[PDB]
Amino acid sequence: ISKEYHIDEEVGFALPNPQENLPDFYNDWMFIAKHLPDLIESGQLRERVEKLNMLSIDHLTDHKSQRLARLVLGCITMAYVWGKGHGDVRKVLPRNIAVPYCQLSKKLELPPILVYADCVLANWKKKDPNKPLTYENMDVLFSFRDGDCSKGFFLVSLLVEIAAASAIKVIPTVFKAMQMQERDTLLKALLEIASCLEKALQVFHQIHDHVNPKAFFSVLRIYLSGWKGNPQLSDGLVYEGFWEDPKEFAGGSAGQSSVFQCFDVLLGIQQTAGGGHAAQFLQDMRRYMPPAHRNFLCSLESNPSVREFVLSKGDAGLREAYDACVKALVSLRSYHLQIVTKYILIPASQQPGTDLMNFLKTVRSTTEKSLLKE
Numbered sequence: 001i002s003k004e005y006h007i008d009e010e011v012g013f014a015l016p017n018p019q020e021n022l023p024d025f026y027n028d029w030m031f032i033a034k035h036l037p038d039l040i041e042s043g044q045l046r047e048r049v050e051k052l053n054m055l056s057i058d059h060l061t062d063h064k065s066q067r068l069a070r071l072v073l074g075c076i077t078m079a080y081v082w083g084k085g086h087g088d089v090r091k092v093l094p095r096n097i098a099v100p101y102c103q104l105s106k107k108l109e110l111p112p113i114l115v116y117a118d119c120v121l122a123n124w125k126k127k128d129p130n131k132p133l134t135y136e137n138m139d140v141l142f143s144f145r146d147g148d149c150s151k152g153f154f155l156v157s158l159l160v161e162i163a164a165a166s167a168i169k170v171i172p173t174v175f176k177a178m179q180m181q182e183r184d185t186l187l188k189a190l191l192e193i194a195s196c197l198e199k200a201l202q203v204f205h206q207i208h209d210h211v212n213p214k215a216f217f218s219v220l221r222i223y224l225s226g227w228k229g230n231p232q233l234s235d236g237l238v239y240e241g242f243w244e245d246p247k248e249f250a251g252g253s254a255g256q257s258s259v260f261q262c263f264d265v266l267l268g269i270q271q272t273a274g275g276g277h278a279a280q281f282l283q284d285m286r287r288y289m290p291p292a293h294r295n296f297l298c299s300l301e302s303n304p305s306v307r308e309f310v311l312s313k314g315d316a317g318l319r320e321a322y323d324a325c326v327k328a329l330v331s332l333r334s335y336h337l338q339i340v341t342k343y344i345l346i347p348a349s350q351q352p353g354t355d356l357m358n359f360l361k362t363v364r365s366t367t368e369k370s371l372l373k374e
C-alpha cells in the first residue's frame with residue numbers, strides 16, 4: 001500500500017505510536033483533558049474551560065501532535081457541552097477553546113467534534129514498548145468519567161482495528177492478481193483475508209470482560225453523542241469566534257471506522273449504492289474519517305470489482321474463497337447486533353436504540369444477500 005493513504009503494517013488504520021504529552025505551551029488544555037472525570041463531578045469543568053486563554057495552533061508542527069490536540073480539545077468539547085449528563089446542556093462553545101479547535105479541525109480535514117479517529121485510533125499508548133499489542137500492555141490516553149468503561153470500549157474497538165490490519169495489507173495482492181490474471185494468487189489472497197476477519201471476531205469477544213451494560217448506556221453513550229438531529233441541541237452547536245450560525249455535526253459511531261466500510265467496498269457489497277437511509281449514513285461518515293483514509297476507501301471503488309471477477313469465471317474455489325470473506329463479515333455484523341442488544345436495548349428497557357438496530361440489520365442484510373452460495 002502507498003504511504004500517502006496512512007495505513008501502517010501492524011497497526012492498520014489506527015495511528016501508530018500516538019503522542020501522550022503535548023509541548024509545554026499546551027499545559028492548560030492537557031490539565032482539563034487528563035482530569036476530565038474529576039472536573040465534571042466537582043462542577044468546575046465549565047469554569048476551567050471559560051478561564052482559558054486562546055492558545056494558537058502554530059506550535060503543533062507534526063501530525064501526531066495535531067491528532068493529540070484534536071483528541072484533547074474534542075474530549076473537552078464533549079465534556080463542556082454535555083456536562084454531568086442530566087439534562088443541563090450548553091449550546092455555545094467559548095472562543096478560547098472553539099477558535100483553535102476549528103482551525104486545527106480545518107487543517108486536518110475533520111469536523112470540529114470527537115470522532116472515531118480521535119477517541120479510538122489516536123486515543124492509546126503502549127505501557128511496555130518491548131511487549132506486544134494486547135489489552136494488558138495497552139491503555140487509553142483520556143476518559144470522560146470514572147467507571148464509564150472508556151478503556152474497555154475504545155481499546156477493544158482498536159484491537160479489532162489492529163486485527164483487521166492483517167487483512168488490509170493483502171488488498172494490493174487481490175487487485176494485482178486480477179489485472180495480472182493469476183487465479184491461485186487471488187484464491188490465496190482471499191482465504192488470507194477470510195482468516196484475518198475470522199480472527200478479528202475472536203478479538204471482538206473481549207468487550208464482555210472490559211465493558212458492562214449499565215456503564216456504557218448511562219455514562220459513556222452520553223459523551224459520544226453529537227448535535228445532528230438531537231432534541232436537546234436542535235439547531236446545533238455555535239462555535240464562538242469562527243462561525244456565526246450554529247453548525248450540526250453527528251456524534252461518534254462504528255460507521256466512522258474505515259474497517260466498517262473497506263471490506264464491503266473491496267468485496268463489492270453495495271452498501272453506499274442504492275440511496276436508502278443506511279447507504280446515506282455510511283457515505284456521510286466518510287467525511288468524519290481522516291482525509292487519507294476516505295481517499296483509500298474511495299480508491300478501492302476506482303479499481304475493478306472483485307465480485308464481478310469471481311462471478312464471471314465459473315470457478316468453485318474462487319466463489320468459496322469469496323464467500324469465506326463475506327461469511328466472516330456476516331459473523332462480525334451478527335456479533336455487533338448482539339452487543340447493541342446487550343449494551344443499548346436492555347439498559348433502555350429498564351427505565352421509565354431502535355434506529356441503531358434498524359441500521360445494523362440493514363447493513364447485515366446487504367452483507368448476507370451478497371453471498372453467492374448460501
Ligand SMILES: Cc1nccc(N2CCCc3nc(C4(NC(=O)c5ccc(F)cc5)CC4)ccc32)n1
Nearest residue numbers: 116157160161224252253254257259260332333336
Ligand atoms: C467489518 C465490521 N463488522 C462489524 C463491526 C465492525 N467495527 C469496526 C471495527 C471495530 C468496531 N468496534 C465497535 C465498538 N465500538 C463502537 O461502536 C464505537 C462507538 C462510538 C465511538 F465513538 C467509538 C466506537 C466496540 C463496539 C463496533 C463496530 C466495529 N466492523
